[PDB]
Amino acid sequence: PVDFTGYWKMLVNENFEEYLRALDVNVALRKIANLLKPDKEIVQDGDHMIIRTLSTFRNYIMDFQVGKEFEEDLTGIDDRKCMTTVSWDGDKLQCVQKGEKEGRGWTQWIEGDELHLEMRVEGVVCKQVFKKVQ
């Protein structure tokens, strides 16, 4: 129902250190992650989506069909593998990442001209907000 396609620049990044720690990211890699302001480059065609999380350090690429469970390789983040499903919730995207960590996933939606992303694991919540450059 919504088209997320765009290059979205980060404006807000709350509790990211707390989220990476809950994934057992070691202290040096958390130190550099503090420098980063990852952007979202998204291309979508219907239920097919590529979400490229771009940073000067390391990118993370997601490439998926909404509603199709897939083996997600989170190499670069915590190098785990998850059984992951992205689903439509109205205009919102809900992601459940099944694996070692409880309650791992995220929610993505657009409010106005703002891309919103909440990342969760073990009850830690990271809030990110992005905007296209007008």
Tab-separated table of C-alpha atoms in Angstrom:
chain	number	residue	atom	x	y	z
A	1	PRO	CA	0.000	0.000	0.000
A	2	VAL	CA	2.971	2.314	0.727
A	3	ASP	CA	6.083	2.698	-1.465
A	4	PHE	CA	9.222	3.065	0.689
A	5	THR	CA	11.525	3.633	-2.293
A	6	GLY	CA	13.966	6.400	-1.564
A	7	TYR	CA	17.325	7.497	-0.259
A	8	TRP	CA	16.593	8.392	3.347
A	9	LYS	CA	19.166	10.197	5.480
A	10	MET	CA	19.382	9.578	9.194
A	11	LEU	CA	18.049	12.256	11.535
A	12	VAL	CA	17.470	10.300	14.770
A	13	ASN	CA	19.309	7.360	16.339
A	14	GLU	CA	18.338	6.518	19.933
A	15	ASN	CA	19.603	3.581	21.999
A	16	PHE	CA	21.713	2.074	19.208
A	17	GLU	CA	24.595	1.245	21.562
A	18	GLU	CA	22.085	-0.389	23.902
A	19	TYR	CA	20.736	-2.461	20.971
A	20	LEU	CA	24.167	-3.585	19.719
A	21	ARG	CA	25.180	-4.618	23.250
A	22	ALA	CA	22.150	-6.877	23.514
A	23	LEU	CA	23.449	-8.576	20.333
A	24	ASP	CA	26.841	-9.165	22.044
A	25	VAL	CA	28.678	-6.818	19.700
A	26	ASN	CA	32.061	-6.320	21.295
A	27	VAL	CA	33.245	-3.021	22.684
A	28	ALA	CA	35.563	-1.925	19.857
A	29	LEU	CA	32.888	-2.486	17.200
A	30	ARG	CA	30.358	-0.662	19.375
A	31	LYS	CA	32.838	2.222	19.619
A	32	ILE	CA	32.985	2.698	15.857
A	33	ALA	CA	29.225	2.155	15.541
A	34	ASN	CA	28.852	5.256	17.722
A	35	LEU	CA	30.428	7.287	14.874
A	36	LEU	CA	27.994	6.015	12.274
A	37	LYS	CA	24.893	7.616	10.797
A	38	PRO	CA	23.562	4.858	8.528
A	39	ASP	CA	21.218	5.835	5.710
A	40	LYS	CA	18.456	3.782	4.128
A	41	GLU	CA	18.425	3.264	0.385
A	42	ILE	CA	15.224	1.418	-0.459
A	43	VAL	CA	13.893	0.114	-3.756
A	44	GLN	CA	10.480	-1.473	-3.779
A	45	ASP	CA	8.202	-3.024	-6.382
A	46	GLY	CA	5.078	-4.257	-4.693
A	47	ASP	CA	5.953	-6.906	-2.172
A	48	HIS	CA	9.562	-7.121	-3.366
A	49	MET	CA	11.927	-4.835	-1.460
A	50	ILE	CA	15.651	-4.165	-1.113
A	51	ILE	CA	16.629	-2.162	1.960
A	52	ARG	CA	20.302	-1.162	1.893
A	53	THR	CA	21.510	0.193	5.233
A	54	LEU	CA	24.511	2.230	4.187
A	55	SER	CA	27.284	3.394	6.452
A	56	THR	CA	30.858	4.511	5.991
A	57	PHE	CA	31.950	1.423	7.929
A	58	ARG	CA	29.813	-1.487	6.741
A	59	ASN	CA	26.551	-1.834	4.835
A	60	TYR	CA	23.799	-4.298	5.640
A	61	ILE	CA	21.625	-5.440	2.741
A	62	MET	CA	18.141	-6.921	3.022
A	63	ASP	CA	16.496	-8.346	-0.079
A	64	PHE	CA	13.168	-10.083	0.361
A	65	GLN	CA	9.577	-10.801	-0.520
A	66	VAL	CA	7.040	-9.538	1.988
A	67	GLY	CA	5.302	-12.516	3.526
A	68	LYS	CA	8.026	-15.037	2.599
A	69	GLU	CA	10.087	-16.438	5.480
A	70	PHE	CA	13.796	-16.582	4.621
A	71	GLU	CA	17.139	-17.414	6.192
A	72	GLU	CA	18.606	-14.000	7.076
A	73	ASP	CA	22.399	-13.820	7.321
A	74	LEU	CA	23.294	-10.879	9.564
A	75	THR	CA	27.001	-11.030	8.766
A	76	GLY	CA	28.478	-7.644	9.560
A	77	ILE	CA	26.070	-6.972	12.428
A	78	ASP	CA	26.297	-9.950	14.823
A	79	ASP	CA	26.985	-12.667	12.191
A	80	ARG	CA	24.008	-14.648	13.313
A	81	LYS	CA	21.370	-16.310	11.169
A	82	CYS	CA	17.666	-15.838	11.691
A	83	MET	CA	14.451	-17.266	10.339
A	84	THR	CA	12.997	-13.932	9.270
A	85	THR	CA	9.586	-12.850	7.972
A	86	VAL	CA	8.582	-9.348	6.926
A	87	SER	CA	4.836	-8.808	6.861
A	88	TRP	CA	2.436	-6.005	6.040
A	89	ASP	CA	0.553	-4.496	8.938
A	90	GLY	CA	-1.599	-2.072	7.015
A	91	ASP	CA	0.896	0.523	5.804
A	92	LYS	CA	3.534	-0.632	8.314
A	93	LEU	CA	6.189	-3.291	7.877
A	94	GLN	CA	6.623	-5.793	10.714
A	95	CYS	CA	9.721	-7.998	10.847
A	96	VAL	CA	10.164	-10.974	13.161
A	97	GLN	CA	13.677	-12.415	13.273
A	98	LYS	CA	13.573	-15.893	14.865
A	99	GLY	CA	16.817	-17.157	16.378
A	100	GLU	CA	19.000	-16.967	19.440
A	101	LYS	CA	17.802	-13.608	20.787
A	102	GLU	CA	14.225	-13.319	22.071
A	103	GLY	CA	11.976	-10.606	20.714
A	104	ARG	CA	14.291	-9.686	17.806
A	105	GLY	CA	12.701	-7.703	14.967
A	106	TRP	CA	11.661	-4.302	13.761
A	107	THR	CA	8.824	-2.075	12.580
A	108	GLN	CA	9.072	0.346	9.657
A	109	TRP	CA	6.544	2.953	8.617
A	110	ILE	CA	6.234	6.388	7.041
A	111	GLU	CA	4.637	9.289	8.937
A	112	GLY	CA	4.318	12.319	6.722
A	113	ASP	CA	7.676	12.800	5.071
A	114	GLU	CA	9.566	10.799	7.739
A	115	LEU	CA	10.747	7.188	7.584
A	116	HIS	CA	10.416	5.604	11.033
A	117	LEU	CA	12.166	2.437	12.177
A	118	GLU	CA	12.049	0.780	15.556
A	119	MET	CA	14.505	-2.058	16.114
A	120	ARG	CA	13.942	-4.471	18.982
A	121	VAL	CA	15.770	-7.248	20.739
A	122	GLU	CA	15.195	-8.602	24.278
A	123	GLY	CA	13.107	-5.558	25.123
A	124	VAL	CA	15.742	-3.044	24.045
A	125	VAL	CA	14.280	-0.536	21.604
A	126	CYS	CA	16.279	1.550	19.165
A	127	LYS	CA	14.419	4.411	17.486
A	128	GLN	CA	15.587	5.675	14.116
A	129	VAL	CA	14.126	8.400	11.905
A	130	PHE	CA	15.150	9.336	8.369
A	131	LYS	CA	14.149	11.926	5.771
A	132	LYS	CA	14.800	12.320	2.063
A	133	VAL	CA	16.809	15.400	1.124
A	134	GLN	CA	14.409	17.898	-0.498
